[PDB]
Amino acid sequence: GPGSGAYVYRSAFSVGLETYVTIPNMPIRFTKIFYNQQNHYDGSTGKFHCNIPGLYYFAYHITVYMKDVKVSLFKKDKAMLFTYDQYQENNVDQASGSVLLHLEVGDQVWLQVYGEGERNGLYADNDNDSTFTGFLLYHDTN
Amino acid sequence: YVYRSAFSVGLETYVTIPNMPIRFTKIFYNQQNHYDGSTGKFHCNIPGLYYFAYHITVYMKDVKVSLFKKDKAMLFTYDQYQENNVDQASGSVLLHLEVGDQVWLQVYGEGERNGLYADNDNDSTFTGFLLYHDTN
Amino acid sequence: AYVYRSAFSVGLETYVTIPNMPIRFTKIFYNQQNHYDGSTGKFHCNIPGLYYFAYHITVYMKDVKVSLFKKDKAMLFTYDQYQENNVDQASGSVLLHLEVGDQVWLQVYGEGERNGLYADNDNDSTFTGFLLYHDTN
Ligand SMILES: [Ca+2]
Ligand SMILES: [Ca+2]
Ligand SMILES: [Ca+2]
Ligand code: NA
Incomplete structure (x- = not known):
């Protein structure tokens, strides 16, 4: 019932590309919202913002058409992970990547x-x- | 207490039927029996946020699949x-589900x-699993 | 408020694969419990429960075919010519229930x-692998 059992810590989003045209040196803005109930992903910028410190899973899937695809998953200010699909x-292709990253409050993650x-x-x-897609898997405890 | 609802399944016949679920019958995990291998459909028993992920070996013909929820196509994955040139196609998404909602691939x-x-x-x-059960 | 944690996420660096040997991923995105052993390429179950595994491979110069092993048996196969x-991207993911002593790796x-x-x-x-649901009594 309301407030009855163990408290559940949620922070998650899952978003898709619509009409946005990618812009060099900017986050990819995914504007189709499959889930973003905590509003921790900002579709106006393409960035996720950590509000709960802990271990996060990120996973992306890209339909590759017309040109090569090469993307980087950024954390804070640094490219962490790279995915290239010629x-x-x-021959439309499918490219994907996924990783776990520990995040502190204020850290941002995005694809570019x-x-x-x-x-x-x-x-x-x-x-x-x-x-x-990204989600909190294990909140930190201390 | 741990709220569990999850399944992970594989294809054993690759012949498909138009307008019908892809019936994955090899069981990697299905401990709650929430996936029905006789139909190819996952049944939500616990309301909450679910992660779904699929991986397809692409051979002989193009592949295009749709993840369905309640007879509505939600997500699409195309690989020529x-x-x-055998290829690998995959998709994954989070969907919120209510009790009774069914999910499958076609x-x-x-x-x-x-x-x-x-x-x-x-x-x-x-594969699909409950990530966060709903609470108030 | 205790959380049961066991997870790893690792990447290939300069390691070159060898037949019949685990692939040794050495870039550490996360391995806080030390349950993945970079010296051997193996994840070891230290908490009985349900685990998710997911891998992503850049395919270049030669066909790729990998097998996800659990306790010395191939469980799952992923082929990409x-x-x-034409660099390609190949991936796989599965849930496996693990018991103490079970090891998981890619070959x-x-x-x-x-x-x-x-x-x-x-x-x-x-x-990448993580404990999703610890077993309870
Ligand atoms: Ca293709
Ligand atoms: Ca290929
Ligand atoms: Ca390609
Ligand atoms: Na691919």
Whole structure:
């Protein structure tokens, strides 16, 4: 019942690409919201913000079309993880990455096209998705 | 107390039926019996936030799948196949579910992009789990 | 407020695969419990329960086929052919219930020839696992 059992710590989001065109050196703005109940992901910037310190899982899946895709998962101010998928004609591809990262309050995580942004073949339409998900797995205790 | 609801399953026949769930029948985990291998459908028994992740070996034909919730397509994954180039396609998402909601995968559309593949040494899998039970 | 934690997330660096041997991922994204052993490439269950495993491989120069092993048996197979001038991305994930003593790791399939895994300063191939639900009595 209300307030009855162990308290549940939640911080999670799952978002998809719509019409946004990637911009060099900027976070990828995923604006389709599968889940963002804590408002910890900001679709106006593409960044997730940690409000509960702990261990987080992040996972992304990209439909690769027209151009190569190369993305970087950033934490705070640093690229942590890289995923490259080359595109050849008539061969849509699927690229993914996932990792665990420990985060402190205020740390931000986001996805960006790698380098100066050329390998930006991320794709979505009414029946194709490119997604980015993150969630708190273990809150810190002390 | 631990709230558990999870399953992880694999394909053992890769022949699909248009407009029907992909029936993953190999059981990696299904301890709560919340996934029904006779239909290919997960049944929500605990309201909350769920993570779903699938991985498909793409062979012989293009693959296009849709993750369904309550007979609505929620998520799409397309991977074209070129000869002599087996591929790997995957998708994952968080969905909030209420008790009674059902989730499954289907080949997209009229079912023609059905190049999913599994055999004795190749897998295509579908996994889901409760992450946070709902509370007030 | 106690949380049962057992998790790791690791990436390939300069290690070169060898037939019939675990793949030794040495870039540590997380390994706070030391339940993954970088000296051998193996995760060891230290808390009986349900675990999620997920891996992502950059496929370059040669076909990739990997097997996820649990207690010396291959559980799960992921194959991705490499065509010239077409780097690919291969992934797999599964839930496995583990008991004390169970080890989990990745190997190249079969005799080890489909070993096109790739990593460098701006490409990754990763392996992650975590305890989702500890067993209770
Ligand atoms: Ca493809
Ligand atoms: Ca391929
Ligand atoms: Ca490719
Ligand atoms: Na792929």
